[PDB]
Amino acid sequence: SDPDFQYLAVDRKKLMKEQTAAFDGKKNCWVPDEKEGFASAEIQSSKGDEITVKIVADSSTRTVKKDDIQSMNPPKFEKLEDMANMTYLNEASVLYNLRSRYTSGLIYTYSGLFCIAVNPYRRLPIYTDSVIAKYRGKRKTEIPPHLFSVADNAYQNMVTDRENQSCLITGESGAGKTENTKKVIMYLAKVACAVKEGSLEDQIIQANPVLEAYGNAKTTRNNNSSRFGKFIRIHFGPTGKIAGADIETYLLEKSRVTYQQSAERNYHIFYQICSNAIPELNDVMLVTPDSGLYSFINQGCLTVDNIDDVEEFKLCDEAFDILGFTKEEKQSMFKCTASILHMGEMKFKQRPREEQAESDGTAEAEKVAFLCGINAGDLLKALLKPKVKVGTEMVTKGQNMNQVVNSVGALAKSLYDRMFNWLVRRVNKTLDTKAKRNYYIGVLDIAGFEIFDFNSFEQLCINYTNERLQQFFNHHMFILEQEEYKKEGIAWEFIDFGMDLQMCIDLIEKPMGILSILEEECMFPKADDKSFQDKLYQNHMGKNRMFTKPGKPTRPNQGPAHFELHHYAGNVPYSITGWLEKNKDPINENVVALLGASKEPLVAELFKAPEEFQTISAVHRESLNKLMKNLYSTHPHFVRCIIPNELKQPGLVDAELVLHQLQCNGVLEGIRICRKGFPSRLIYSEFKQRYSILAPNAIPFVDGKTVSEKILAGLQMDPAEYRLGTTKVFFKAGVLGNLEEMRDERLSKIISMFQAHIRGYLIRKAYKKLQDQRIGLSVIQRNIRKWLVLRNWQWWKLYSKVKPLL
Amino acid sequence: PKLSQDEIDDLKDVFELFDFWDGRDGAVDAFKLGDVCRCLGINPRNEDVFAVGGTHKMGEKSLPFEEFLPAYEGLMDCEQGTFADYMEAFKTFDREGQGFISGAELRHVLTALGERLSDEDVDEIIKLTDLQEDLEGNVKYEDFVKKVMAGPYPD
Amino acid sequence: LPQKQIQEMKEAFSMIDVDRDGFVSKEDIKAISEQLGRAPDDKELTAMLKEAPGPLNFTMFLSIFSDKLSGTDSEETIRNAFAMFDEQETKKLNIEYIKDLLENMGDNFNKDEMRMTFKEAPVEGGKFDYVKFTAMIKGSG
């Protein structure tokens, strides 16, 4: 009952006293305000354009420009569920609606075709199994806004239209993408499931605890930041049930493996592998239950405020079990993880006179070679003095201190990335059931947009992907939307909402671009950081308005900057130091040869040559395009996540930060095209079968369009509310939802008529008897009356006294 | 709305019968208005009968044969279900699309939605129509729909 | 009305007509009524003679008796009517049902007709034996 709608619905009873206020659209209005973004004001003085208001907030006075004022919606629209229904669609109204709901506990709000999700920063009782039970098969307009309706609506469209769907969850770092991705998958897994190691559903869910252990790590913005992107496809069979699932990963930040910045951590897997949560494993990995003991993970923080590294390690172990992993594969992974931990502890020194580099004990290199399945002596040899071959030769040569710390770092980075990708394949192996697949629902969760005090390649790459996804949204929400109208013969004058990021995207992606210059300079044996900065400034400085010389530092303690990039979500100062190196990853075939033939099964697999790499940017640029295209083949459903404030605090709203997010996101624009265009569209085939019942009148097959025309015509639908396409019928916002209501009113009526027919049959059955019982009762009442009149007749009361003696 | 000859008298007949069963006195209780029309062949929804004057419980108001005639002609023109309307309603409750609906669902639809029939009526309409559910416990609603529409005395 | 029946009506009339004047009066009724217990009083006596158009001779006597004794049904027709309200043919009706039928349906019995009808009807365990009551009605016993 109502109880489950605690943090989902609007009381409206107590909120009925919130829509019953003294309002006046001529008096009350929104006025810009440094603090709260917009302040509720009440107009007073008049002066051509110099309008003088009174800010209700602090009962103060202020004079604003008649052009800075914004219309305020009446109380009637408080905490409105779908913002596209407000009377005034302006940045202030949208801000107030979300803020109002946010403070009430309502974190989900619809805005035309997409959904808005504000991070709650605390657990809400809205994801139980009971809530899931109330959202199944529901229409968005029929039940409160919830991430679940988006998932369901996605499922409904997939079976109805027979087309793949994709849920794109966008947002800045920490806005709540991953959290929402989880619930969407959990929801589909509990309404689409079919009839040691668990079932498929269970496995889809357990796939999360492990990838996150290896792919997430504390960050200034997120204590559980996702340092890799993932596209997960859930497959469906004929009967509309789950039949498999695959996962795809994108750009796993390898720098974090051997380095961390202040107040930041290495991947979670490292701290839980040293949590002594499972003692019987310390001797399998050979580690001391002390994280602050290893240099590869003790550079920053060791513990996270809301992360219990212990229980988390237990859940990880369990996940691996439910995932169908043997005790071997499972321990195989755990070991290679510790191998890296130890790699950081290996010590080296520069030989006495020949200032070069040599071993310095072997306790650590021994533990390493042990877990990895090789010879500790064959290891240090390949690190201290390699034999660079040429075609089929060898050139033995030693190295110095930094040359060696890099080769070891490189070995850690390679083993980890190589193992993460193995973890994914293995997981897909499990989720790949050979059931029949017809359609899929894809969920995308990339690493959100972010700005650190120091931004390098990592951030360029990430913000790039976000740039390109925001563009996939406006192209789809503003350009295709309109191309579609025109293509259907609909008279439509094109509108330009000003949502195009090609400039910044082409600056990075195209041949002119940064990544192209970077890719070019990895082919030059002696390219330098300075050389790169030149080619960049040469083709873009003062030459492109998106490329800009680093402005004046606007934050406490921020590292070197070589150029700023005007991204959709903000301007970012990048440092191009070490990029040439980070882009192309050196493959020391001396060590890949060793690890190649390792007694260790996993490591042996992780390192296989073949039979008889490009740069990272090239790989990323291609992969991103391969995916961006696959998404055009689907029907996107967008969820826009939003981070409330910068304190990870519940209920606190930073008006300027939210506004900034609503702006670059294009929320306002999205709501406008929804009310300016025809968001609803239905192929005539589907329209017929769903609404013929709204006018059974006809029906003496008949083509779909004609039938669709008779129904709308006969329904007296204002010709302005819809358009007959050449294939689909388009509806204004709000329309198709009332037809759904009528169609339900109709169904409830037809049902009540069938019930009256039953009531009428029960009676008509008892008719014969009723009239035959009228005969019976008239006879009974008549003969009882005679009997009475007689027994009480003076005369009879005499004929009986004499009768005896006759 | 122009009652023929048979109709005008079948109503008089049916009127007296119901008049007799609540105390022959030229009156019929308003709570039996709907029931009287059902006897005539009309299948009025309870919403209609309340409209044309029908009461909610016995004893509130009686009706002379005069005030009756209008009500009958009022319910006379309301909408009556058609096979197609009924079959489209039932189809929204059948997933497999084979023409089968759980026996539990049937009782659900009939007693939970619309103007809810009591469990007693649902049982009785099922015994009368001889609705047989099979082993899996399903029923072919098309068959049930046809029976209900055919009336108590088919052939 | 049978012949053996008429024969009993005569002897009866012969015994009621004291003064042997061929006609029955208020003096004869009283006289023979007193020898059997209780003189319907002059109050009621008038009414008795008020039930005959004119003189009260054997012709009238036997006439007023047929009126008030003919126009009934066979013990099998009443038995049948009661059976129409007993589907489970258990031969009995629940007391509350048959009292309801009689009092608030058809030609409603007034409160008085109810008391007299039930002051002597067959009823045990809430069951109203309509068969034994049918017999009783046909005044044979």
Ligand SMILES: Nc1ncnc2c1ncn2[C@@H]1O[C@H](COP(=O)(O)OP(=O)(O)O)[C@@H](O)[C@H]1O
């Ligand atoms: N729906 C939610 N319910 C509870 N907590 C959430 C929710 N969304 C976000 N959070 C909190 O905020 C943080 C950011 O979550 P997240 O999904 O991980 O960000 P990204 O968008 O960085 O994935 C989480 O670790 C969590 O503590």
Ligand code: VO4
């Ligand atoms: O912090 V998040 O990187 O997962 O966007």
Ligand SMILES: [Ca+2]
């Ligand atoms: Ca009556």
Ligand SMILES: [Mg+2]
């Ligand atoms: Mg994430």
Ligand SMILES: [Mg+2]
């Ligand atoms: Mg005499």
